[PDB]
Amino acid sequence: GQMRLPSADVYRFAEPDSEENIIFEEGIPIIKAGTVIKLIERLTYHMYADPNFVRTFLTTYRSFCKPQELLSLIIERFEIPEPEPTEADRIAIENGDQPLSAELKRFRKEYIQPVQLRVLNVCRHWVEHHFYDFERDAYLLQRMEEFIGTVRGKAMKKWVESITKIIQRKKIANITFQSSPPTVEWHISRPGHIETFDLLTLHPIEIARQLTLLESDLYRAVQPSELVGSVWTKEDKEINSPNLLKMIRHTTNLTLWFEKCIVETENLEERVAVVSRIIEILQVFQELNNFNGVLEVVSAMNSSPVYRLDHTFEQIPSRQKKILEEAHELSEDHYKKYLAKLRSINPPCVPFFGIYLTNILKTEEGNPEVLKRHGKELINFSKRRKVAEITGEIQQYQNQPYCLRVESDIKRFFENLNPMGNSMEKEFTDYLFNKSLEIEPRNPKPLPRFPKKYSYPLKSPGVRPSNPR
Amino acid sequence: GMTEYKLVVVGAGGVGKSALTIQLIQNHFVDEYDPTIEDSYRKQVVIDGETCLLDILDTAGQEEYSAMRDQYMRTGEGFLCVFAINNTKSFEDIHQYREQIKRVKDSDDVPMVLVGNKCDLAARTVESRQAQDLARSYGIPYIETSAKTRQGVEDAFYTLVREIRQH
Amino acid sequence: MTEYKLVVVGAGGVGKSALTIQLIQNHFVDEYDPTIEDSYRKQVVIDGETCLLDILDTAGQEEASAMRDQYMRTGEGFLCVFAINNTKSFEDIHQYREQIKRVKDSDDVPMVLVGNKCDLAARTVESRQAQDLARSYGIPYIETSAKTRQGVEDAFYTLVREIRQH
Ligand SMILES: Cc1cc(Cn2c(N3CCNCC3)nc3c(-c4ccccc4Cl)cc(Cl)cc32)cc(C)c1F
Ligand SMILES: Nc1nc2c(ncn2[C@@H]2O[C@H](COP(=O)(O)OP(=O)(O)NP(=O)(O)O)[C@@H](O)[C@H]2O)c(=O)[nH]1
Ligand SMILES: [Cl-]
Ligand SMILES: [Cl-]
Ligand SMILES: [Cl-]
Ligand SMILES: [Mg+2]
Known about the structure:
With about 475 residues, chain A is mostly helical. Chain A has helices at about 35-45, 50-60, 65-80, 85-95, 100-130, 130-135, 140-150, 155-170, 205-220, 235-240, 240-265, 270-285, 290-300, 305, 310-315, 320-330, 330-340, 355-365, 380-395, 410-415, 425-440, and strands at about 20-25, 30-35, 370-375, 375-380. Chain A folds into 2 domains: about 5-170 and about 355-395, Up-down Bundle (Son of sevenless (SoS) protein, Chain S, domain 1); about 180-355 and about 395-465, Orthogonal Bundle (Son of Sevenless (SoS) protein, Chain S, domain 2), CATH 1.10.840. In chain A, about 55% of the residues lie in helices and about 5% in strands. In chain A, helix 3 (about 65-80) runs antiparallel to helix 5, helix 3 (about 65-80) packs parallel to helix 7 (about 140-150) and helix 5 packs parallel to helix 8 (about 155-170).
């Protein structure tokens, strides 16, 4: 039969399952709700491992349990009492013989060792993937070091000694490819001549590549701590979500730069060359699966200052209109085609983060923290599972690196891009709209002519890559 | 067959704006939600005896993507401009949202409603009279809603559809 | 998107974790941190079909040897890994093979035999010996290096193909 358990009076995690302490969803069970004691029991269950549950729990638990309290509870979980000798053991001992201790040996092998190992796995994951708890609370770190550092007994020794080293490593804290990256491409601006870098003088292929490297790095830097609890929307967002905000502010700046490049080009012919070049960059973004970049361009083309430029629209080649149309359709019907495309491509890619943000926020806002059952308040864990499914998807696309070479000067150019200058947002976006009105006035006002501003050739070198020996 | 109305929710972040559409679209009587579910933002309703379909865009959480506002707004036929009654700044933002909507739609007469949202028990700082005065100055309806009790929620969306129908 | 549940098994220190992390992150882990149980996901197009790999990285240390049934029940295919400079790890393969067959109650479980650390000159297990074993199991044999990436995609994606055709 089943192993007997310690008394629930000396070991809390031996209380029987009931609807007053745990509720399952309708081949391991999926938890809908439970007390924190039951959640931790199942997190470290003797019958099976649940690595997904460990990630889900460690990502989301701070909404129902403090870090100090979590550590106390898993230490309590770890300290399991051994059962007393049985009648057959007693009789052997009374005869001066060695007891078989069959029940004790089974309990050690099938209850204590798996549970203790799974507690250690929680510790290992906590330190490796959620170390911010310890960065923000030095005392918590001391407690973890002390707990791990005083676990005795040879069964756990390998992992205890390892986790100690991992902790010490994390305190004081390389990519391999299947191929060589392609050659960096140059157009009018030549290597080292950063003063001449601009939309039309850099090679459009290399603009798309370097922005993709930049946007990929920004995407990869966002941690779940910046997302859970909807903290990027609250008053302390600059403290709690700095990498996310840096990523969004980059996207916003690039979109505005595209708009500024377009409406500050007053000559119609030149402005057509600018828009065509932007749609070529979009084409390369698509080829690279940089969906963030695709939407940066689409956002610019749908902006109030740019959208209304019918005279410019009329001269864009049909094949480029088609490219823009297809990109625009990604966003239609609540991003239906985008979501399907993302789930079909071969990474690396750069997702659009906005959809994730809205889904995390609405999941948080639209589900209760607790379920009330039989007079008891149970933690609504299904809500946390839903949030962690989203953070899990985000993390899955953060793993794959782009096989593209960094160009340090082009990188710096786009890192330092500042289209708004010292102007506030409203004053700048009014400026862009007024430029739009200047260069293509509302009917029936006549269309003016404007002088050229670029002294170099406007012909694009195209977006198919070259390859010298 | 039946008419579909494309509605867009706009307003400051961080102050409970998402509760409006969630409470509407929700299984009214089970407080639960999966926003990832295809058509968790579409609802068939009967307004003044006429059946229609509401398609609601609420990009709550994306407020920092400020250059995407035009793109999102362009999709809408009618707009709910939402502020929180305990956040004066969100109320002061309304003017610029309205100006931006007028620009994007290229019209001085876009169907819209002003919504004052009670998102918690913190002290009210925008009185109903201030909001009524603002709405009147714009020539649009004012509706107050609760983010907890669902009060006002149907009224906000139905009033907007009536604004579209009567445009 | 079809989802595939892969499990990586084999003796302690043979490079199960390094192989997995090389696949997932294109990074070679130089440290030896014994695993308890780790899981990873990877979206990838294989033979023109997009799928989602769930990869379970398991414990090789003997102290964890009584905890395997639970992960073997869930796996759809198994990478059976040994190191070509460690004959004991090669001898441990048959124990994993037999346990998997017992737990899944089947003579026909998708598997690939993997000989890892092929970047090292000092080999003690010859390819022929491993290939003979693989043939007796009816499965392919692929030599890999988590350090250089040699064979790594081939090993995992061959296992996917075997699940797909199962
Ligand atoms: C300056 C300028 C503005 C626009 C702004 N705009 C326009 N205009 C149509 C003409 N009147 C103004 C709006 N159509 C689109 C499309 C689209 C959708 C369906 C089919 C074909 C297309 Cl191209 C996609 C997007 Cl993201 C922006 C669009 C477009 C281009 C190519 C420009 F050069
Ligand atoms: N030269 C070389 N070293 C390797 C290779 N694969 C792994 N190693 C090294 O071998 C050691 C063990 O690697 P590891 O991946 O941790 O092995 P494991 O099988 O996961 N161990 P465990 O079963 O305890 O979890 C590490 O020092 C690692 O760098 C390889 O292909 N080549
Ligand atoms: Cl009605
Ligand atoms: Cl206020
Ligand atoms: Cl992963
Ligand atoms: Mg390992």
